[PDB]
Amino acid sequence: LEKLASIDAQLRLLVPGKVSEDDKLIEYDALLLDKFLDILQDLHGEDLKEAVQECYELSAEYEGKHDPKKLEELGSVLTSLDPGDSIVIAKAFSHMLNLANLAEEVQIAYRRRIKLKRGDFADEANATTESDIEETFKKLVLKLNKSPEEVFDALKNQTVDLVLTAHPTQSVRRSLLQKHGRIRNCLAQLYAKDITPDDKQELDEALHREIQAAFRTDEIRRTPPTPQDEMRAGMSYFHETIWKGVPKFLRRVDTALKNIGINERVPYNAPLIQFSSWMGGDRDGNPRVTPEVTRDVCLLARMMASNMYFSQIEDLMFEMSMWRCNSELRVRAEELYRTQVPPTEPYRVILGDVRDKLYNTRERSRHLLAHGISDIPEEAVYTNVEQFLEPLELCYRSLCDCGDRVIADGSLLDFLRQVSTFGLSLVKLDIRQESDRHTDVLDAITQHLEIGSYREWSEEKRQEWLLAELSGKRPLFGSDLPKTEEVKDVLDTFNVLAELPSDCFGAYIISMATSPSDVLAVELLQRECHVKHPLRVVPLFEKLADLEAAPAAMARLFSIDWYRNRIDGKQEVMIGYSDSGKDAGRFSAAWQLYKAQEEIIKVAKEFGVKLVIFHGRGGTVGRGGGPTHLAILSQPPDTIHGSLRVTVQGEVIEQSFGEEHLCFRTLQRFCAATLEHGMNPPISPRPEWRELMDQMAVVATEEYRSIVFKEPRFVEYFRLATPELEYGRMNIGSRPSKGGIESLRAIPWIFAWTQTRFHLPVWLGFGAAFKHAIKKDSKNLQMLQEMYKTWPFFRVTIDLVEMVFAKGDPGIAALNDKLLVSEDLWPFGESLRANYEETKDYLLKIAGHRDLLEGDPYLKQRIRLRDSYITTLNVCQAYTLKRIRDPNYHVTLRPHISKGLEDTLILTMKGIAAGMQNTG
Amino acid sequence: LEKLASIDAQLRLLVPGKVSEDDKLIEYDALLLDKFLDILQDLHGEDLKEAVQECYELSAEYEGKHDPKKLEELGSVLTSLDPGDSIVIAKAFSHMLNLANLAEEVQIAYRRRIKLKRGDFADEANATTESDIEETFKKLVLKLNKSPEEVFDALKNQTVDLVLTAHPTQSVRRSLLQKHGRIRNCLAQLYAKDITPDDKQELDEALHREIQAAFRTDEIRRTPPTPQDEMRAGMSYFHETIWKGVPKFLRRVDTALKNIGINERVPYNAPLIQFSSWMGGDRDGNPRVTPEVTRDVCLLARMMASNMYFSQIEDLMFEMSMWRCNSELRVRAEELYRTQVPPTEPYRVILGDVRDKLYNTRERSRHLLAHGISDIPEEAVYTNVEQFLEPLELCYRSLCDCGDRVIADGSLLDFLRQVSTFGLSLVKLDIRQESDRHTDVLDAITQHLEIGSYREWSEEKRQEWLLAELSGKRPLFGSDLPKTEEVKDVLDTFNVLAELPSDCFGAYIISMATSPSDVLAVELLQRECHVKHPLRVVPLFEKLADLEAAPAAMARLFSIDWYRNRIDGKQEVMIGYSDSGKDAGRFSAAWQLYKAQEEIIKVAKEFGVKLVIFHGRGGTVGRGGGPTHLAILSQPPDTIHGSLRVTVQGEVIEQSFGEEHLCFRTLQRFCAATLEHGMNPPISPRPEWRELMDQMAVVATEEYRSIVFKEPRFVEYFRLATPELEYGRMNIGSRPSKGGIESLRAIPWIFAWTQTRFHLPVWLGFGAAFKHAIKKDSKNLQMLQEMYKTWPFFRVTIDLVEMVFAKGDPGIAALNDKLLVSEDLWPFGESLRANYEETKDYLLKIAGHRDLLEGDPYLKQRIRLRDSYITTLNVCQAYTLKRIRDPNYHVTLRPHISKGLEDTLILTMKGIAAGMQNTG
Amino acid sequence: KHDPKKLEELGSVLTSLDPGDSIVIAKAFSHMLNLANLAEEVQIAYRRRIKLKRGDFADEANATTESDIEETFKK
C-alpha cells in the first residue's frame, strides 16, 4: 500500500539531505518513482516491476560502496533478458532518469534566492546568489559611478543573440515536452500551500496519468528524422516558454528601470534579444543538409512565426475594444472599412487587416513549401518586419495620444516586443560550410576558364585574384559550368541565398577558416551567385595553429579597402571550444582562446572595427544556469562590447528554456552579465600568471597529443572502449568522421567518452600541466590557488572540469575494458585511469576542495541523484555492445518476464546522453 | 502618496470588520478604489477626482446616520453638473460599484469552508457550510441507508437543466467580462502567499491597467442591441468558465465516487448537466423576436459550438501521440489514410477527420447565416451528436483495450463529457409565445374554412375539434390562407421549427396557459406546419386562478388518449414566481405554488406520467450561492424526481458563473441538492401550518390587491415615483406593457420598484398576513417562529424577503416622492412606507432577529459595502428624472470640472440594477 | 473489529507471566494510558475556537464553540 517512505529513505541514505523547506528534490523523486513503479506493474506485471526494482537496488549498492562486482551482478541480470524484456527495462531506466530531471527543474524553479550576499564574483556562479537585472543596475550606479541614464543608454544599445543548434542525439518530440510540462506543473502544484485535499487527490491522478502518457509515447525509430523534422522539434521551445518569456522579461527590465529612477521603458524596438538558428543551415560535413533543406527551413520558420502572430493577434483584438483614437488612426480605420467589425471599434479594424496579412503570409509560405508556387501574391503578405510594425505603432501612438498609455503598455506593448524580437521568422538562419568546399568551387571555375588552378595558387595570389574579380567588370561563370556534385551543391546553396529574402538569414560561417582568402572566396561566390544582400562572412578558427594566426588574418582583411568598405565597421569571428580542444586539449585551448580574443579585439580596435565574438559549443558559457553568468563576466575585457552571440547547445536547451521560470532567468542572466561586463571587465591576469599559463599549455598540449595522436594503438583502443563506431553507423544526427582523430568531429569525440563516463577530452592534459607547474616550483601551488580564488577565467575553467569529474566513474570505463577491449590493451586503459585520478587529485588541491563540488552542493546533489539510473544504462550498454560485436558470446536467457539489440543500444545511448547533458 | 489607509479606515468605520485571515473584502475594496481614484485623476484632473470623492463622502455619511438632508446635499452637488460632467461621475460610481462586486467574487471564491458542522438543513443555506458532492453521498449512505450502488444509480439517471435568459438591463459585452476576469485574477494573486516583491510590483501595474481598460470600454449606446447580439453576449460564460467547469466538476464527482467505494466513473454520456436557452426564442410580448431571429440564434449556437470543439480538438490531437491501438481503430485509421499525419499516429488520423467535419459544420453554419445557401453539403458535416461521439468512443475503447484506460480518462474523457453535455449547439432553444396568439391563428383558420370562429367556441368544443383535427385525414390550411401580420408571424415561427433540426430545440412554452385546449392548439399547429419532431408543449400558469385550475387541466390532458400516447410518459409544466406574485402578491403566490406543485405531482402519479417542474424567474432557487442549495432541498416531496429544470436569471449569471470556483460550486450544488431531494424530501407541513398559511394567503392577497388594483390613484402614483415609463421608452430589452398593472409585465414591475430601493412587489401583503395571524391568536407567533425554525420552505421564503429588505431604503423612496410626486399623493407614499416598516418589523420578530440578516453576516457585509455606491446613483437618478420630466426646473450649473440627460439616466438605471441584482 | 478471541489471545499472553514480569507490563500499560491523557490535554489546550456559530444552546456543549466571557457579556 505505502512504499513511498522506503524509496525516500533509500534515496536519503544515498544523499544526506537538508532541512530547508525548499529542498524537496528527494521527495519529488520518491513520489515520481512510486507512481512509475505502479504504472510498470499495471502495464507489464509484478514480475517486470520486480526486475526493475532488482536492478535499481544493485545500482544503488554500487553508488554506495563502488564495489565493481555489483556491476557484474547487474550485468548478469541484464544479459539474461530476451530482447523484448531488455527494451522495456532500458525504457524504464530511461524514463526514471527523465523524471529525475523534471524533479530537478522544479527544485531549481522554486528554490529561494539568498537575500544577504558578499557581492563578489563567486556569487554569480549560482542561481540562488547571482545578480538579477535590478541588482546589476544598482551595482553599476553605486560601485562603478554610472548615472542611471548611462546604464539605460548602454542597455538600449545592447544585443544578446542566442543561436539554436541541433540536439546531438535527437531532439525530444514537441508532444513529449508538453507532457513533461504537465508533469512538472502537477509536481509544483502538489506542494503548493494554497490548496485543499481533493484538488490533491486530482493532481495525484493527473500526475500518475501524465507519467503514463509520457512512457507510452515511445515509438521505436532506427531510421532517423529528416533535417526538416529535426528543425521543427528544435523550434518547440518558442511555443513552450520563449514566446511569453521575452515580453515578460522585458517588463521586468522596465520595473528595474523605474526602481533606479528612470521613468522610461526600453523602446519596444531596442533589439535586446534575438534568436538565430543553425538547423538546416549547417552543412559542414553533412550532405543530408541540402539546398532544398535550407529552402524548406526558411519557409517553415516563416510559417511558424506567422502562425503564432496570427493566433496571438486574435487575443489582442479581444482586448482592444476601446473606441477613442487620434485622427491619424480614425482616417486609416475609415479607409480600411470602406474597402468584419464595426467602425466604432477602430483598433479592431486595423488589427483585423493585420490579421489577414498574417494569414496570407502564412498560407503563401505553406503553398511554397508544398508546391513551389502560390496563387497568393507578395503584395498581400508581409515581406519586411516594418510593414507589420507600422500599424501596431499606429495603435500605440493613438492610445497614448488619447491618454491611455497605460493600456498601450500592456498586451500591445508585449506584442510589439514579440514582433520586434522574433521578426517575421522566429530565428534567422546561419549557413555553415568548410573552406575546402569553397576552394573546390573556385578551382572548377579557374580550370574551366583555362587560367590555371586556384587550389595550386599561393595565398598572396588567391587574394590578388579574388580582389581583382570582386571589382571585376565581367561575370565569372555561367550555368554551363561543369560541376561535380559537391560543387553544384555549394553553388545551389548560394542560389538559395539569392532567391530567398534577406531577413531569413544571418551569418555565413566558414569552418576550418585560416586565411583571408577563405573569407574573400565566399564574398565573391555570393556576389557571383547574385546575392543582392550578402550575408556577413564569419571565419571559424579551429586548430591551435589557426588561432595563433587568426589575429594577422584579421589584420590583413581589415587593411583591404574593398573588404573594409564592405563590412561597414562590423565583423563577427567564431570560436569553437570543443573543436580547438580536440586539437590541443582542453586546457591549452582555453588559454589560447582567451589570448586569441584579446589579440583579435586589439586588431579590431586599431582598425576601428566593432568585433563580435560568436561562442560555439563547449565553452563555459554553454553550461547554463548560474554558471553561465560568471562565465560571461569572465570574458576578456572589451570582448563583448555590447554584443553577445552564443550557442545554445541542444543538450542544454531543456534545462535552459523548458520551464518558464528557468527560461526567464536565462534571458535575465544573459542581459545582466552582458551589460555588467561592458562596464566592469574582470581583472586582467598578472604577468606571473600569464607566464605560468604559457608554460602549462606547452606541457598540457604535449601530454594530450602524445596520447591522442602519437600513440599508435590509440585509435584501436578508442574504437573498442567507446561506442563511437556504433554512434556513427546508427547515425544519430550528422556523420562521425570527414582517417584518425584529426578527421573525427568534435561532437562524436565528446560523445564517445561521455558515454563511458570517462570524459577524457575534458580533462586530459590538465594533470601534466599541474604536476609540472608544482614540481618546477612548489610556490606554483599557491599561485595556482590564488588564480582560482581571484581570476574569474581560471575559476570558471576549473569549475567546468570539476563538474565533469562529478559525472565521472572510472569503474564504468574499467568494465568496458574488461568486456570490449582485448587483454593486450588493458595496461593502456589502466594508465589512462591512473591519469584521471592524478588529474582529479591536483584539481581538488588547486580548488581547495576535499571532494568534488564542495563549492556547489546543490549541483552535487543533482548529479548524485541521477547516477543510480545512468549507471544501470551504462552496464546495459556495455553488455549490449558485447552481444552486438561478438556473435559467439551467449548467456542463458530468462524466460520472458513482461506482459532487437540495436534498439536497446539506441535507447541506452540516448539515456546516457540525457543523463550526462553538457560536459565539454 | 498613501491614501490606501484612509479609504480602508472609512470603510471599516462603516463595517465593523473581522480578524479572519480570509476576510479581506474591505482590503480589496480599498485597493481597487485607490487605483481607480488615481486613474480618474490622470484622465480627468484632480478636480474631477475631488468631486467624486466629495460625493462619496456625503453618501458615506448618509449610510452612517441616515440623515435625509445628506441626500439633498448630494442632490445639490449632482444637479449642478453640466451633462458632460454628470456622465463622467455617473460612470465613476457605476465603475466603483462593479469593482466592489469583483472584490466580492474573490472573497467568496477563496473563503474557507467550515469543517465542523451540525448537518442540519440551515447549513445548506451558505457556501461555507453547505454539503459538497462527497458529503451528500456519505449522508445518503449513512443517514438514509442507501447502498453506494443505489446512490450511483440515482445519479446516473439524474438531469439538471439550466436555462439561460436575457439580462433585463442588457448583458455585459464579452470583452468586458474578460477584463473583469483579469481584475479578479490580479486581485487573487496580489494576496497569494506563494510569490515575491517584483511579481507584485507587476501585478499592481497589471491591475491598475486593467481597471483603466475596463473604464475606457464604455461606448455610449441609446439604440439597443439586436436580439442576435444580445444572444451572443449571453453565451459568453461558456468560453469563460462553463466549458471547462463541466468536465472539472464531473471529475470531482468521480473522486467522490472512489471515496464512497464505487470504482466506476459516471458514464461520459450520462446527461447530468444540460443547458437550454430562451435568447431568440421567447417572443411573448416581444415582436423584435421574429422568425428570422430564431433561425439566426440556432445557427449562431451551432457555429459557436462547433468553433469550440474545432479549437479544443487541436489540443487533444497534440496529446494523443500514442501509437498502440486495437484492431478496430487500426482498420479505420488505415481507411481514412488511404482516402495530414503519419499512419503511425492512428488517434491523430481519426481526430483529424473529426476536426475537418467540425470545421465543415462550422463553415456551413456561417454560410447559411450570411446567405441562406452553402456549397457545403450536409453529408460532410455533423447533424447529429452521435456521429461526432462515435469516433471519440472508438478512441476511448482503443485506449482501454491497449491497457491505457488511465490515459483515456484524462483529456479524451473531458472531451466526451463536453460533447455529450453541450451537444452540437451549446444550448437547446425554447420557444415561448402567449396562448391568445395561438387562438388567433386558429380563428383565422376556422373563419377561412367557413365553419365558424374558434374564439367563440367553448372549451369543450375547442378540445373536441382540436382532437378531431389532430387525427384528421386531411390538411387544414394552405399558403393561400389570409393572415394578419401577427398570425403570419406565429406560422412562420412554426415553419422555422419544421425546417431546422430537432437538436436545436427544447420546449414550446405557452404563456398565459389556462386550459387543455391551450396545449392541444400548439400540438395541432406543429403537426399542420409539418414539424416532423414536435417540441414538447409546456404550459406556463400565471395567475392564482390559473394555478388553482392547473391540476384539473393536467388531469384532462392526461386522460386524453391521443395526448397521453403522444407525450410518452413525460410532461413539463412551468411556474413563474414573479408573474404569480404580480397577480396576488408574493406570499400568496409562494404558498399557492407549493400547493400547485404538490397537486400536479399527485395527478401525474395517478396517470403514471413523469412530471418536470420548470422554475421560471423569481423563485428562491434563482438566488444563487448557498441559498440555491437550501431552496432546492425545500421543494415539495417528489417534485424533482431526478429532473431539475431551472432558470438562470440574467441578473444573477455573473455571480453564478463568472469566476471559475463559483461556477464549479454552482454546478456542484445543483447536482448535490437534486440528488439529495429525490431521496430525502423535506418535512411535510403540519396541518395547523397549512391552515394558517391558507388564512394568511387570503389576507395577504386582499391587502396587495386593494393597494395595487383597487386604489384608483395607484397607477398614477407608480408612474411618478418610479422610472417605469422611462424604462419602457428607452427600452432596455423587451417592452413594458402588453392598460394597468394587469397589463404590465413582471420584469418591469420588479425593476421599477427595485430602482427606488422600495421593492414593494416582494414584501407587500406579508405585513397584513403576519399582523392578522398574531391578532387572531397570540400563539400564532410561536407557530410562525417554529415554521421558520423547522420548515425549509418557510425559512427560505422569509430569507429571500429579508435579503430584499437589506437592499431597501425608504429614505430613497421618500426622496423620489418629494421630487417627482405631486403633494396630493404624499400621504399615500407615506402610508406605503409605514407598511414597509411594519412588514419588516414582523419579519424580524418571526425570524428571531434583531437586525436584518443577523443569520448571514457575510451577506450583510457584502450588501452594506455596495450601498454607498448605489445610493449616489439613486440620488443622481432622482434628480435626473426631475430634469427630464420638468423643463422649467433649473439650477445653476458649475463651470465644467473635467479634462445628454437621457445618457445619464441609462447609466444610473444599469448601475442600480448591477447593484441590486436579484430581488423578486 | 471487536473479535472476542482477541481478548483471550491477550489473556493467554498475560496469564503466562511470572509476577515480576506481570508487574512491569501492568505498569507499562498504566503509563501509556497516562501518556495518552497528557496528549489529550495538549490537544484540547491548543485546539482552535470556531469563529462562525449559531449562538444556540448546543454551541455551549463543546470547548470549541462555547461562549467566552466577552461573548456572554455581548449576548
Ligand SMILES: N[C@@H](CC(=O)O)C(=O)O
Ligand atoms: N547544466 C549543469 C550540468 C548538469 O545539469 O548536468 C551545469 O553545467 O552545471
Ligand SMILES: N[C@@H](CC(=O)O)C(=O)O
Ligand atoms: N445573490 C445574492 C444577493 C446579492 O448578491 O445581491 C443572494 O441572493 O443572496
